[PDB]
């Protein structure tokens with residue numbers, strides 16, 4: 001007859017035990033008759049034993065900087081076995097919280113990347129990427145790319161196919177993200193891709209044409225950036241929408257009191273770059289719209305066309321600007337991800 005054997009997922013005296021996984025105990029040639037896990041000051045840890053009595057596991061989040069003591073007894077025909085193990089979990093120098101976009105349960109356009117923004121700089125980008133689990137249905141190849149030291153993006157080679165489910169699990173709790181930095185918690189979001197909405201602003205015609213699944217549904221006269229401050233060419237991703245908003249140039253680095261500084265309240269504004277490009281109402285330039293460029297870079301349209309855009313275009317839809325005397329929108333703008341060539345995006349920049 002064999003004496004029961006106890007096996008635990010941790011070892012007695014271990015330090016730096018990571019807290020991204022549960023602690024378990026398994027019995028062999030016998031069953032678990034008693035399992036308790038207690039922190040430094042005696043508080044019991046929630047756990048559950050399997051019906052067949054063979055495996056116990058913690059069922060709640062284990063804490064950073066804890067010393068836990070596990071006590072287990074196994075009983076079998078051949079006798080008894082009891083063990084006591086004490087171990088210490090990870091002690092972070094710092095915690096960072098991730099924030100994910102887009103919103104949970106949202107429907108977005110075919111240009112929307114998965115966005116994970118940490119509230120601290122990440123020293124080990126690879127460890128962050130590894131901790132982020134993206135599911136797509138139908139499955140599609142995609143890749144991570146960092147816009148800066150805190151925010152990473154994931155997208156496919158081409159615009160999403162309408163009807164695609166996207167699930168994002170950021171499993172950073174218990175994960176060492178470099179230089180003693182650990183995830184403050186996990187976060188999860190799920191979203192779905194809607195209709196293909198692509199609006200093209202052609203500087204040769206000064207028209208903003210809105211296509212939904214390939215069909216023209218709207219043609220808006222526009223006035224883009226004057227030659228001195230032109231609208232950059234390229235692919236812009238639609239972000240937030242505002243019934244009205246005070247445009248403050250200092251938000252985008254430009255002192256209000258300075259030469260092309262400004263602080264103006266505007267109607268029906270749809271943001272399409274972090275650098276401050278909006279589609280918005282411009283009653284002052286309705287005469288110029290469709291004829292000459294007169295703005296600071298924004299896409300001036302009529303009050304009714306700005307409101308139409310507000311009502312009918314959603315986060316993640318696409319605005320393409322072409323044929324202007326500007327350069328190309330920076331790939332790392334914040335809403336310019338599609339201007340990065342796929343070979344470069346796919347290669348990433350985690351190192």
Ligand SMILES: *C(=O)[C@@H]([C@@H]1N=C(C(=O)O)[C@H](SC)[C@@H]1C)[C@@H](C)O
Pocket residue numbers: 247248262263264266276277278282294295296297298299300
């Ligand atoms: C965009 O060009 C700016 C925005 N558009 C303006 C315009 O005149 O077209 C006004 S300046 C009076 C407003 C500030 C900015 C947000 O980029």
Ligand code: NA
Pocket residue numbers: 108109110111194195196197198316317318
């Ligand atoms: Na879209």
